Design a binder for these strands. Structure first.
Ligand code: ZN
Ligand code: ZN
Ligand code: ZN
Ligand code: ZN
Ligand code: ZN
Lengths: 154, 379, 303, 379, 303
DNA sequence: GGAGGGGGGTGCTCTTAAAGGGGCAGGTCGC
DNA sequence: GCGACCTGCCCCTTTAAGAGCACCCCCCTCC
């Protein structure tokens, strides 16, 4: 039932995204450019405004403490499956990422960003957040910083 | 010629529809349509059972050299060794001069993979396509010969001799040979745990070259018109043509300088294919692991969009005139890339650390989700 | 010179003639390692011998080298003959070092098997028999000096065993880089003295604790202005200057495995991996046949 | 497969419609349609202006060796010279085993031309036809490798190395290299008036090969039946196969013994084609005349039926692994052939005095009416 | 006296240092005649020098030798130095004959240019100064003997000039196979009649109307059984046994050009083409400086 | 019968920021 | 003069959380 693979693009100004199937174009347009709405988290004090129905379901787990992911080795608990998947690396002792200059291997891009401070590279970077000038390299990271920091809520 | 920006056929008074690549029958797998078949054939060509000779009752050095590349042959007189190779490249670039230069560099690379910075002699092979207008043959072969000779000149040697044959496809090759002392080359069987792998040239030349032949076909182009525009395709073509024409002489020199253990040339098969072949030589029980894959601008996306035609991510994409894959200790590699990036002797060129040498039973691999260090288009 | 290559060439020629006669009388097929299909016959001249043929040939000489009268060579003169052969090879354009190069490892093992059970002979009326090998002899054969990573490592071993009085392999294995301390000890009376020496604590087993005497419990190496190429301090500093920063400041091991590939301008010659007990013992046992070291250790133990 | 006197495609689980020669376009003019243009290209790739350097203000021997084949390159070590050759041919014989031997022998004919009698190393190129079915490859290519390595072993060398490529026609090749002293090879430039020429192998194998390929198809065989019987194609085919697979090693050893002024190999351009090249590199003012041609039995008649495709009587008949063309003094030549015919160890072969050498203008030519000697086939 | 190859190597090394200094000074572009694109630098050691480089260097040395400190050598000594260089090359593996090998034709011409204008080095007591070159010096090297065809030819010319007293090239050209005759003359020892000798027309004077001269007006060459490899006759028989059959019996010529390609078992070494006049002159000039021959001709003039 | 569209919810890979433990480096009191 | 103790600040790593795509599941459908 997998549709044959082609590629299409949304033509909305400022939207250069490309979808791996013709089907996903309508989903993308609805969920990004048409489905404009605001929701307020049910928690009394959270006060974060979300525009998708789905995002609230995840945000519900944030405020509650219903952990379900149990590590195989140390039997620790975690609040998300991918969090546990990352944690499993420690017991397995794998360091996939590797800085391409000095060969300093780590387990996450958070560490690799810290290492990049040494090999001065922020000069090459062009992107930067308009709030506090975080001086990023790519665009999705800009949205990540606007979400984690400089939040736009209430 | 090198100085000219490009090659305009009308400048040489040929037909505008003349593309040097027209003669070859290009394929995503390229010259290595099957790899296992040709791997076994190459092994058969290099198979010799009597060489063990009871190990000569000791640790007799291997005559096949790398076992699969740059065979080293001890000689009767002088205590010297014969270090020679050979490689044959079909045209993949519309510039005959640059194509001959690329062929010479590809032939020479296998010497530099063993830290041989000087080549005594080089022969040549010059195929002549049957389906090639006799008028065109006269205006192209001089350019290809000039490119080959110029590349040899830049390598501190001189092509003298060869053979000219007729084949349905243009065939270019050579035989780089060198007679050098034991203190002049590096035997690549010294890898130890904790080492790092350094790549001297970005990957993806095959994809960029093949895509340029789709820039004319409207059927194939419409497949990838979304992923990559035409201008950046042209940039990638220009750079893959320029990168494929360099020489690894500086790589060999800094290989000797910085205590390199083993190195190999990424030509055909794939980066993983050559590493696996490399791993089977090491005396120690080591296993390579590649954590990064340098690639030209806007090439991984095309590899995804073209299906299994190319296969960059998995490291099965064959390459022409690919850079060395050296094995250094960490600190030397950290110093290695900095110097090759800014060598006072010549012009700058980058180099990336792409993996580590774990402990294993002589096999390489690629992590499930390798990263793509996009190589800026010389900017 | 005090080292004569002609003797080594003559010994090799005699042995090669004997072995070739043995092979030809046997008349059993055997192919040389060289590329051209040739019958294995040891070159009567050393220079033309291949790298693989030397290793097999030299190994046998340790069990089949005879003298003109026919008496088998004693271990000391046999090591001296091998030094002569090495000098010959260096003199005739060759570059291989029959003691350090990896292709010649089996020869070193056989040499160690030969020299393992060597003890002084008092058979001559003189209570001491002076060995034929000498300090200046090795210096002539380029075995000691800053020439190559292996020779430099052996040179450091030679100067430690002479001055620090380290004779057994265990004593060296106890030696660590942190323990060896270098101090200026400049004497204000002598202006611009610029004195220097490396000092090492001795492992003397005594009930009493504390520093009874600074000089008695610590050995020193003295700068030698006669030849800077022979100064132990100059070779020691050059050793550290050509070692990775990681090892420095460690207290585990002092001798580092040579890197297989080096260049005249290579910043680092050595690898962090220390040398194994087999190689350490082979190097020491050879550095315990020289006459200078032999008499030096003779002096220490007696008094 | 070695001991077997012939080939049986059915015995190897292959359909009898399998002809090894089906993978090449046999043309009467040979592998290369043009000679002067191809010769011009080979000269272009053998031409280097800086190679002269006013003769270094000294007596410097050519760095291109013969100037047309088997270049000799001085080395930095021990006053040694590096002599190497290369020549790639396509399958011309149905037998896969014997084909590899022919490819090896051809690669060494140029080396035995310079006088070198021993070889140190020998690479090879193995092109696999993309039109070849996979199951055929697994039982055809190995035999080529087997024969190539057996010929190398008989030559006193080991095939250490190689290369595998994909090419619409089977391409068999190799490079033979020797590191020899100046007193071991002959530079062919000392020809003087009053000398005779000797040919070590009968001429005209291409005719027998083409006639045997035409045997099956009647669209061309019908006409040839009148002149020559079919059975004569098979015996001549056997003789051509056998002769092309015997090395000139014995001949090279005898050139030193009997004061050979010059020698060359009749490979790919014809006896007249390689006589002009040989006579173009004689420092004296000498020319060559071919008063005889020892054609293979009953092939001369078939040559006339199609004078354009073959052109044997005129001399420009391509050859594959032909004999050496030496220039000996008349007194010694009478003994050169006598010794080669009946060697002490056995396995002798005949040789003829094709012509004489006289003062001229450094060009060869065949008399208008040369005599043809029908070399009786061995049986 | 004997040969001292080390001294020849020293001369070469001094000249090489000076010439390399000049090459670096001029800072031109010159490429060595080898495969690698290496700037022409004359090796400080002979052995690693190519044939072209060796030829070119040897030529310039005859002008630029300045062997004596601020003093150039006389033509006599240069021959000694080049003989030493040839001996060194023989002893160090090379196979180059700087005198007769066709690749070095340019060199021998320059030596002939330097030597042809011989100026006797006279003293107040008379020109009794014997040149530094002697017969034993040439025979210690490969110049005279039966090793290569050119050496055999020069040996025959040497013996001719030393016994038949042929002091000029024109006298030599007049000699031919038929003129010289092998005589089995009766020896003083009756039981042994084996030894022969070869005689040539000499002092023939005037044959007018059958003028009577002594029946023995020739110069003989008796056997020298001390060394079989020095015998005048055995070399003559060996020479005629290697010359082409057609040559023997003619009166046109005696010295035959050697075939460029020769093997140890080659039945015939030479070619019918007789030696050139210039080659006669060069060989004679090189053979005439040897001290022994000067004495042989010296006694002739006295008597 | 049916493949295609609509609607919904979800895991996975990537990214960034926040929290946190370890270690280097000050100032103060005691010996 | 030298050390121990408390505390502050930075470094590097691990956990927590958002973005968006590819995917599945269900339902409906008019042809
Ligand atoms: Zn959009
Ligand atoms: Zn909330
Ligand atoms: Zn866990
Ligand atoms: Zn880094
Ligand atoms: Zn910000």
């Amino acid at each position: 039932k997998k549709p044959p693979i082609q590629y299409v693009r949304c033509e909305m100004e400022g939207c250069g995204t490309v979808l791996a199937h013709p089907r996903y174009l309508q989903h993308h347009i609805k969920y990004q450019h048409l489905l404009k709405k605001k929701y307020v988290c049910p928690h009394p004090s959270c006060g974060r405004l979300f525009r998708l129905q789905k995002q609230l379901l995840r945000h519900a787990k944030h405020h509650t403490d219903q952990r379900d992911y149990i590590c195989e080795y140390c039997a620790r608990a975690f609040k998300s499956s991918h969090n546990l998947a990352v944690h499993r690396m420690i017991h397995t002792g794998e360091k996939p990422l590797q800085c391409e200059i000095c060969g300093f291997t780590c387990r996450q891009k958070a560490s690799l960003n810290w290492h990049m401070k040494k090999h001065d590279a922020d000069s090459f970077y062009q992107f930067s957040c308009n709030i506090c000038g975080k001086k990023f390299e790519k665009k999705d990271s800009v949205v990540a910083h606007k979400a984690k920091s400089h939040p736009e809520v209430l | 010629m090198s100085t000219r920006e490009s090659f305009n056929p009308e400048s040489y008074e040929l037909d505008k529809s003349f593309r040097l690549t027209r003669f070859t029958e290009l394929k995503g797998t390229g010259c290595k349509v099957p790899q296992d078949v040709l791997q076994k054939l190459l092994e058969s060509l290099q198979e010799n059972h009597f060489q063990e000779d009871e190990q000569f009752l000791g640790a007799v050095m291997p005559r096949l050299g790398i076992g699969m590349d740059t065979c080293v042959i001890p000689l009767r007189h002088g205590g010297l060794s014969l270090v020679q190779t050979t490689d044959y490249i079909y045209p993949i670039v519309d510039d005959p001069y640059m194509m001959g230069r690329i062929a010479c560099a590809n032939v020479l690379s296998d010497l530099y993979a063993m830290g041989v910075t000087e080549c005594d002699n080089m022969l040549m092979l010059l195929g002549v396509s049957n389906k090639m207008t006799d008028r065109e043959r006269d205006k192209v072969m001089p350019l290809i010969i000039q490119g080959f000779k110029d590349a040899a000149e830049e390598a501190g040697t001189s092509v003298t001799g060869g053979q000219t044959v007729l084949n349905p496809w243009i065939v270019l090759g050579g035989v780089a040979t060198t007679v050098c002392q034991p203190n002049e080359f590096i035997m690549p069987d010294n890898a130890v745990p904790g080492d790092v792998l350094v790549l001297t040239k970005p990957l993806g030349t095959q994809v960029a070259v093949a895509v340029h032949q789709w820039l004319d076909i409207p059927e194939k182009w419409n497949k990838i018109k979304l992923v990559v525009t035409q201008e950046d395709v042209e940039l990638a073509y220009q750079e893959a043509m320029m990168n494929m024409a360099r020489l690894n002489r500086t790589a060999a020199g800094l290989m000797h300088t910085f205590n390199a253990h083993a190195a190999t040339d990424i030509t055909g098969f794939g980066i993983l294919g050559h590493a696996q072949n490399l791993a089977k030589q090491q005396r120690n029980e080591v296993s390579f692991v590649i954590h990064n894959l340098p690639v030209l601008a806007k090439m991984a996306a095309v590899s995804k969009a073209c299906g299994n035609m190319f296969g960059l991510m998995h490291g099965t994409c064959p390459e022409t005139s690919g850079g060395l894959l050296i094995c250094l200790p960490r600190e030397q590699a950290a110093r290695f890339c900095a110097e090759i990036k800014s060598p006072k002797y010549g012009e700058g060129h980058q180099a990336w650390i792409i993996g580590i040498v774990e402990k294993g039973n002589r096999t390489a691999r690629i992590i499930d989700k390798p990263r793509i260090i996009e190589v800026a288009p010389q900017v | 010179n005090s080292l004569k290559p002609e003797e080594g060439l003559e010994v090799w020629k005699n042995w090669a003639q004997t072995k070739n006669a043995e092979l030809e009388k046997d008349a059993q097929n055997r192919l040389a390692p060289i590329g051209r299909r040739q019958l294995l016959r040891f070159q009567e001249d050393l220079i033309s011998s291949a790298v693989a043929e030397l290793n097999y040939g030299l190994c046998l000489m340790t069990r089949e080298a005879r003298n003109g009268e026919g008496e088998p060579y004693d271990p000391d003169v046999l090591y001296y003959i091998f030094l002569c052969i090495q000098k010959y090879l260096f003199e005739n354009g060759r570059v291989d070092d029959i003691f350090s190069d990896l292709y010649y490892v089996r020869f070193t093992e056989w040499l160690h098997e030969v020299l393992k059970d060597v003890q002084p002979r008092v058979t001559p009326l003189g209570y001491v028999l002076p060995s034929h090998v000498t300090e200046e002899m090795l210096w002539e054969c380029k075995q000691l000096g800053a020439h190559s990573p292996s020779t430099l490592l052996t040179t450091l071993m030679f100067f430690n065993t002479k001055y620090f009085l380290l004779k057994t392999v265990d004593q060296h294995m106890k030696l660590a880089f942190s323990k060896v301390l270098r101090q200026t000890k400049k004497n204000p009376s002598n202006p611009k003295d610029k004195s220097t020496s490396i000092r090492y604590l001795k492992a003397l087993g005594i009930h009493q604790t504390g520093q009874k005497v600074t000089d008695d419990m610590y050995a020193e190496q003295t700068e030698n202005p006669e030849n800077p190429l022979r100064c132990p301090i100059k070779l020691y500093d050059f050793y550290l200057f050509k070692c990775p920063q990681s090892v420095k400041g460690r207290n585990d091991t002092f001798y580092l495995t040579p890197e297989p590939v080096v260049a005249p301008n290579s910043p680092i010659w050595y690898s962090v991996q220390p040398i194994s007990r087999e190689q350490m013992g082979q190097m020491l046992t050879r550095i315990l046949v020289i006459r200078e070291i032999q008499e030096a250790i003779a002096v220490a133990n007696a008094s």
